[PDB]
Structure 1
Amino acid sequence: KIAFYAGLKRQHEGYEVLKFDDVVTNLGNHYDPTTGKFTCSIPGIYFFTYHVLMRGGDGTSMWADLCKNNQVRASAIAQDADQNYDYASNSVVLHLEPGDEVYIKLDGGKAHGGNNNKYSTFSGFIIYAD
């Protein structure tokens, strides 16, 4: 039983990994809120989804890509000329081997720190085990 769901507390920017440290669910402790990465332990098929809210009132564009190890497996953008709140979200189904790391990487722009509202989220779970 592998499943996790965490939210983003603090604001982020640039090209850094998003540390979702508002952890709500973490069966097996395979997600690390100190690095914001999900480490695969059992080979198999996994679903991941992420929602990243852009910082409002400061900036027009923000990118958030889901990476496996050091390869982009999903890309997303939030854009608005009037600096409005908008979401960079995406979902993936991937096969993972032991040691594989899955995380959400910013690719430019500013993310919102939602404190306790859990605006920016990272969630996932194993569908099938090999």
Structure 2
Amino acid sequence: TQKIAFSATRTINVPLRRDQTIRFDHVITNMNNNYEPRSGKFTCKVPGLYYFTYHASSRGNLCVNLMRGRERAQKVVTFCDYAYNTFQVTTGGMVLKLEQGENVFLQATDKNSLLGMEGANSIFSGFLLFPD
């Protein structure tokens, strides 16, 4: 019986650099501890089908790449959402079939306006749908 799930928010007050792995340091949930707060990466132990999602608060233009891979990561998709002199909350999600050892994470881009704070959260979550 493999109960795997994680929800982590970003509280670190530091800007995001281009191609930087976006870290969600604050864990709300981390069943089976397959998600690592220090890196912001999920690493598959149990292969199977997973759903990944995020909600990012932002004060400007923001683009995020959803990444997948083992020792070499690749990008599944890119989610962009713009804001001109205003605040926004954007979202993205993806169902991915995962093999043992593969890791999934979000990577920042040239558009790095992302807020991580009390009253304006940025969260990253993932859960196992069906085990391989």
How has the CA–CA distance of structure 1 residues 98 and 118 changed in structure 2, closer, same or farther, with 3 Å as cutoff?
farther
CA shift digits 1:20-64 (9 cap, x unpaired): 11100001110000000000011100011011222x2xxx42211
Q: Is the 8 A contact 2:57 2:120 kept in 1?
A: no
Q: Which TM-score applies when normalising by structure 2?
A: 0.86
- Structure 1: how far apart are the matches of 2:90 and 2:54? 8
1:121 corresponds to: 123
- Structure 1: how far apart are the matches of 2:89 and 2:67? 18
1:31 corresponds to: 35
| Residue identity matched to 1:63 | C
CA shift digits 1:79-103 (9 cap, x unpaired): 122x211234211000001110100
Alignment of 1:66-81 (within 5 A): 66-69=66-69, 70-81=73-84
| Residue identity matched to 2:32 | G
- Structure 1: how far apart are the matches of 2:95 and 2:61? 26
Q: Is the 8 A contact 1:12 1:113 kept in 2?
A: no
| Residue identity matched to 1:27 | M
- Structure 2: how far apart are the matches of 1:68 and 1:118? 27
**What are structure 1's unaligned runs of at least 5 residues?**
none
- Structure 1: how far apart are the matches of 2:123 and 2:34? 16
1:103 corresponds to: 105
2:94 corresponds to: 92
What is the percent sequence identity of the aligned residues? 32
1:43 is aligned to 2:47: yes
Instruction: Give the aligned CA root-mean-square deviation in angstroms.
Output: 1.5
**What are structure 2's unaligned runs of at least 5 residues?**
none
CA shift digits 1:100-125 (9 cap, x unpaired): 010011112221121x4461000110
Q: Which runs of 4+ in 1 moved over 6 A?
A: none
Q: Which TM-score applies when normalising by structure 1?
A: 0.87
How has the CA–CA distance of structure 1 residues 2 and 13 changed in structure 2, closer, same or farther, with 3 Å as cutoff?
same
